[PDB]
Amino acid sequence: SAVKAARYGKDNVRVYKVHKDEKTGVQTVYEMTVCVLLEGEIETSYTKADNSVIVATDSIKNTIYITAKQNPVTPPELFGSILGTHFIEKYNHIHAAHVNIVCHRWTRMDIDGKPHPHSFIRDSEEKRNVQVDVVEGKGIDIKSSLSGLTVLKSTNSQFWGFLRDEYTTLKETWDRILSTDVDATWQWKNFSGLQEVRSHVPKFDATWATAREVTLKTFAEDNSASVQATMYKMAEQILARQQLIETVEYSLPNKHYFEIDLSWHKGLQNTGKNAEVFAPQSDPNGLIKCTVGRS
Amino acid sequence: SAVKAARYGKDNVRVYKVHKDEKTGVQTVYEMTVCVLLEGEIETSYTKADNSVIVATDSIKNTIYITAKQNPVTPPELFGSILGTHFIEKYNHIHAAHVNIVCHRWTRMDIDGKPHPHSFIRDSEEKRNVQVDVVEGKGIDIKSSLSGLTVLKSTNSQFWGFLRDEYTTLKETWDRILSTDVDATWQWKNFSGLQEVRSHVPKFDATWATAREVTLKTFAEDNSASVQATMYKMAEQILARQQLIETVEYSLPNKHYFEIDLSWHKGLQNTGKNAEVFAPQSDPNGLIKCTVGRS
Amino acid sequence: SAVKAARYGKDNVRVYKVHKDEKTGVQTVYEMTVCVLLEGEIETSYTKADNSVIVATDSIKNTIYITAKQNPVTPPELFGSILGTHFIEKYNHIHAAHVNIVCHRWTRMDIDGKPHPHSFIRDSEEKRNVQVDVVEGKGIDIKSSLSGLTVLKSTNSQFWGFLRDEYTTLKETWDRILSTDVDATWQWKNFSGLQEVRSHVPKFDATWATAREVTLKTFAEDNSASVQATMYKMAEQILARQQLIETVEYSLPNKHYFEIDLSWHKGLQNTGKNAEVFAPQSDPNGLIKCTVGRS
Amino acid sequence: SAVKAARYGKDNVRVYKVHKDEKTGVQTVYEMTVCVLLEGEIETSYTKADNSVIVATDSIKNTIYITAKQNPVTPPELFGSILGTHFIEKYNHIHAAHVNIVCHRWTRMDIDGKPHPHSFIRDSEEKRNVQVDVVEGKGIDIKSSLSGLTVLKSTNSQFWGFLRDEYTTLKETWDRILSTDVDATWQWKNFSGLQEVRSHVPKFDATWATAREVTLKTFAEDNSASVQATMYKMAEQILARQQLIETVEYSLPNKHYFEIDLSWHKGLQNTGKNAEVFAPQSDPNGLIKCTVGRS
Ligand SMILES: O=c1[nH]c(=O)c2nn[nH]c2[nH]1
Ligand SMILES: O=c1[nH]c(=O)c2nn[nH]c2[nH]1
Ligand SMILES: O=c1[nH]c(=O)c2nn[nH]c2[nH]1
Ligand SMILES: O=c1[nH]c(=O)c2nn[nH]c2[nH]1
Ligand code: NA
Ligand code: NA
Ligand code: NA
Ligand code: NA
Ligand SMILES: [Xe]
Ligand SMILES: [Xe]
Ligand SMILES: [Xe]
Ligand SMILES: [Xe]
Numbered sequence A, B, C, D: 001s002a003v004k005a006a007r008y009g010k011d012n013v014r015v016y017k018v019h020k021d022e023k024t025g026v027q028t029v030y031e032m033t034v035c036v037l038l039e040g041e042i043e044t045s046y047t048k049a050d051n052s053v054i055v056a057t058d059s060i061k062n063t064i065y066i067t068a069k070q071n072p073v074t075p076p077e078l079f080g081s082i083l084g085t086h087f088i089e090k091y092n093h094i095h096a097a098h099v100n101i102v103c104h105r106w107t108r109m110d111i112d113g114k115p116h117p118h119s120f121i122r123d124s125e126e127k128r129n130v131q132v133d134v135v136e137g138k139g140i141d142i143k144s145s146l147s148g149l150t151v152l153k154s155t156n157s158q159f160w161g162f163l164r165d166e167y168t169t170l171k172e173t174w175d176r177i178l179s180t181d182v183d184a185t186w187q188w189k190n191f192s193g194l195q196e197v198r199s200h201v202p203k204f205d206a207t208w209a210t211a212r213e214v215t216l217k218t219f220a221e222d223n224s225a226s227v228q229a230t231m232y233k234m235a236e237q238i239l240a241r242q243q244l245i246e247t248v249e250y251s252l253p254n255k256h257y258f259e260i261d262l263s264w265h266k267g268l269q270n271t272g273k274n275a276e277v278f279a280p281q282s283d284p285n286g287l288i289k290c291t292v293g294r295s
Helices: A041-047 A057-070 A074-088 A194-199 A201-221 A227-241 B043-047 B055-069 B078-090 B195-199 B199-223 B229-241 C043-045 C056-070 C078-092 C196-199 C202-223 C227-241 D043-047 D057-070 D077-088 D194-199 D201-221 D227-241
Strands: A002-020 A025-038 A094-104 A107-111 A114-119 A126-134 A139-151 A179-186 A245-254 A257-259 A277-280 A285-294 B002-020 B029-041 B094-104 B107-111 B115-122 B127-134 B138-152 B177-188 B245-254 B256-259 B276-279 B285-293 C003-022 C025-039 C094-104 C105-112 C116-119 C127-135 C138-152 C176-188 C245-254 C257-259 C277-280 C285-293 D002-020 D028-042 D094-104 D108-112 D114-121 D127-135 D139-154 D176-190 D243-252 D257-259 D277-280 D285-293
Touching: A002 A057, A002 A094, A002 D227, A002 D243, A025 A057, A025 A074, A025 A114, A025 D285, A041 D227, A057 A074, A057 B276, A074 A126, A074 A139, A074 A194, A074 A201, A074 B055, A074 C116, A074 C202, A094 C025, A107 B199, A114 B199, A139 A194, A139 A201, A139 B138, A179 A201, A179 A227, A194 A201, A194 D114, A201 A227, A201 B107, A201 B115, A227 A245, A227 A285, A227 D002, A245 D002, A257 D194, A277 B055, A285 D028, A285 D201, B002 B043, B002 B055, B002 B094, B002 C245, B029 B055, B029 B078, B029 B115, B043 C227, B055 B078, B055 C285, B078 B094, B078 B127, B078 B199, B078 C105, B094 C105, B107 C285, B115 D243, B127 B229, B127 C245, B177 B199, B177 B229, B195 B199, B195 B229, B199 B229, B229 B245, B229 B285, B229 C003, B229 C043, B245 C003, B285 C025, B285 C056, C003 C043, C003 C056, C003 C094, C025 C078, C025 C116, C025 D127, C056 C078, C078 C094, C078 C127, C078 C138, C078 C196, C105 D201, C116 D201, C138 C196, C138 C202, C176 C227, C176 D201, C196 C202, C202 C227, C202 D108, C202 D114, C227 C285, D002 D043, D002 D057, D002 D094, D028 D057, D028 D077, D028 D114, D057 D077, D077 D094, D077 D127, D077 D194, D077 D201, D139 D194, D139 D201, D176 D201, D176 D227, D194 D201, D201 D227, D227 D243, D227 D257, D227 D285
Parallel strands: none
Antiparallel strands: A002 A025, A002 B276, A002 D285, A025 A094, A094 A126, A107 A114, A114 B138, A126 A139, A139 A179, A139 B115, A179 A245, A245 A285, A257 A277, A277 B002, A285 D002, B002 B029, B002 C285, B029 B094, B094 B127, B107 B115, B127 B138, B138 B177, B177 B245, B245 B285, B256 B276, B285 C003, C003 C025, C003 D277, C025 C094, C094 C127, C105 C116, C116 D139, C127 C138, C138 C176, C138 D114, C176 C245, C245 C285, C257 C277, C277 D002, D002 D028, D028 D094, D094 D127, D108 D114, D127 D139, D139 D176, D176 D243, D243 D285, D257 D277
């Protein structure tokens, strides 16, 4: 037997950082969950019980806190690139670092119409994520994403004209509820190293904001022919607005809301144009994915 | 042996309702999870296999949908009171109905600065809940609550002057992070029946909004001496603003964020006044409760 | 305003203890999650910011570890009683302690037919729990429970003869699937104090084992007329076997498995006597409760 | 813009099947959660709103139930291969099917020492899974796995000799607790089609049982030098026992249990050789992966 692939590290490292403006008194908080996995010349820890090649996962944890102390933690694309670069530069035998960051929302509270200097609310479980792969000699690959963005529209969604055969019971419809949890990922062109990532720092927050805005606007305004058609429109627009993105991937559940026929009860009308009360279905769910790139 | 207490019904009934304004084209959605448990002269179903006394839980489910079709579902205090009253009036041998409703957030989207007519976003997992107990001959008892409201302040929290003995290691502090998930419940005076609940309908949404506002403002503005002291201030204010409330209960976890001593690493300073990076603790957590009533 | 009720303490305290037999080399592990909430003369911490009455929740955490170091942690009824008694005896102004313990399964592994001395497996998420309320001058009240015991029988369950009216669509049946998650609680007679709890130590594990055995056997063997009827039979038997139990409470979801009509597809027969493939329903679910006591 | 990749289908389809032996009266149940995603010539549904190429996800759901009615559902490697093959053969424009199956445990109850004919218990949340990729012209690729197998050993684990630098605080140890949740995957050699999968049917259950047995025995018996070293020993043995496996992958969290220094309290000794009470850590956790193949 032989080791074909190996990676190891520390997962679920929760980190909070506060920034204090001494001039204005305003405080800003950041909270993330971080995972770092390393690869390199470490096969002997597996095959020969040679621990001398192991940077202890406990030390990886320490390094995450130290790096957060000494560097900005925002945008997460930059922090992830700093953290990954550290490992490949510090340890001769480590040749790749894989950094995953989930950013949790702490939104400044408005109290009596004004922004509070040091009080925050978690408005939704929507996350902003990054995956950063730093590979010695091959630069830095960054995938940015938003996830956990849950939306619903109560009309202006259709689904008709699909394949009908002996396995089909679904009725065609010209008016249905459409609800999904949005997972959208944009993959940046490969960067040569940290200097190049630093040069593009302003683009990271701007592209996240654009991706979010395009997602919400397109969902709200499209008279949707299907999840497939609406999601493609989203992806097309993001690629048009940021030339440094190579691909956009969406993964969308179709969270079904079923009509409830109540006609057995005193002829009550609750279907088609008369439908008011629906039964949300926990499962099963449609799952629709697409990756869109440039011509 | 004897049956001392019994209740049975249907839990986890998901319900969505849409309201369509034909004039303006504006649609409004409501989504809830409902549980109804019944009590009454049903002991023989347990002791004698006498199913003739059982309103099937499946029928309870049907009734929830029918009631939602025929009545307003908002405010939830009213819907719960209608639903509970139905069971005690329809079935001679059922003498109490217990209705729990969890309301999920569907917040209208703003697209380009204007409210969208039919598109919604789940902004946070904060819930608005009601528990309604309808008891034949004893009226309607309603407890309203908000839950899952997660907040953090990065300064203006203290904790010193507590009991110190041989079990104590905690250091006194004059500046710490305070973070909690708020669970707040207000209990209404007993109502004589549905007519009286209907008479107070406008107070329900208003009191929910007040409870939320008082909670957020007090948390943000109090230079907190402890969770105990800050929570009491919240409860006192809610009781002062709504005379039809008899008690207010808060249940608050104290979600700890620990300082990380980094001084072992090149003398890095990250404690006390120099603390910037902290480790959020998943567990254990403080749990602080209080019920506040009138003199 | 006035404080009507208050309690505070530490939740989610995870504890592991190992016992090492130096003679045989055999090790035995215990793992629990513990919550302790205190009550007493503590109103001033809420109303006057008087922290001098507060035993810090951090100190409560320390006390749990110290108590586990110095005492047996099994049976959990005994450990909970020791822990609760500690607080009311040590602190003059604390008059009640409420201790909740969840015990997690670590079952010794069998390797090649023999019990391994120090290796364990988590066989199921079934828990054994206790709630211990220690109240100064009123003794010790203990509720013991098992929870998370998930079972299914594929036949020998019926449900017919229930009330039928204009809200009813459910068909009567003489053969259905019955599946539930069992939550069963037995409440002990009040104990005068720790000496009395110690005197009954052997009964705690024995009664847990009996409750479990009676639950499983009755479920498997009863040709069930309803959940109500089968659960009553369980409760009756437990009360008959342990005279020191005052009441038994069961709370049982009815986890539905629906027939799937496939007759639209080439006349395929999959209902009634021909039913082979079913659709488990995540929600809604029946919820059936009963508390059984002595004549 | 262009579609680079697309797949769509139905997730979270819960399925139960019962087998009834008319001779013996013995019933056997199977319960699974199934996901099927399709690929093929479907780009126009995304780019042109051409729904004519879409096999509706609702129809995919129907097909899963029909296929389960007409075929054995065990071993899951066979069921997955039948289900995937169906889609690529039935639809000219569908060229790949991806089938994921999670099998839930329903273990026959022993009542009074004998196996019950129709009563079952969920003993643990351990799962047996398969991923089956059926690609037109390239055969059938199957990955089998077990997951959610949670184990702990209280001694005979060591970790010393790792890299020490200015980021390291971890102490070397010759005796620690080792606990993990096992995720193990074995990848079969590519099969040419369904006939070949059918020819190997007996190997599927046997290899699952072997993988499980080797995992448990190795964990219990190895005086572990590290997670890395112990996991490699497991993988090596599985590859030696089943020649039709090409690779074995393990992904193992290192779930930490920390010593608690109690010496501040009356000199209580609870570290090193005196350690009895430990604090399980929910997070962070080590994460160790390896893929082992043939020379
Ligand atoms: O088994 C281990 N492997 C590791 O890589 C490691 N790092 N810290 N502790 C550890 N334990
Ligand atoms: O066992 C049952 N008890 C009930 O009360 C019920 N109601 N619907 N189905 C049922 N099954
Ligand atoms: O606000 C607090 N209240 C308490 O009771 C406590 N105990 N430890 N830390 C604490 N913080
Ligand atoms: O938008 C949809 N896309 C689909 O592929 C589908 N299949 N069933 N319903 C559907 N809705
Ligand atoms: Na390197
Ligand atoms: Na009545
Ligand atoms: Na006392
Ligand atoms: Na095909
Ligand atoms: Xe952070
Ligand atoms: Xe609703
Ligand atoms: Xe324990
Ligand atoms: Xe199945």
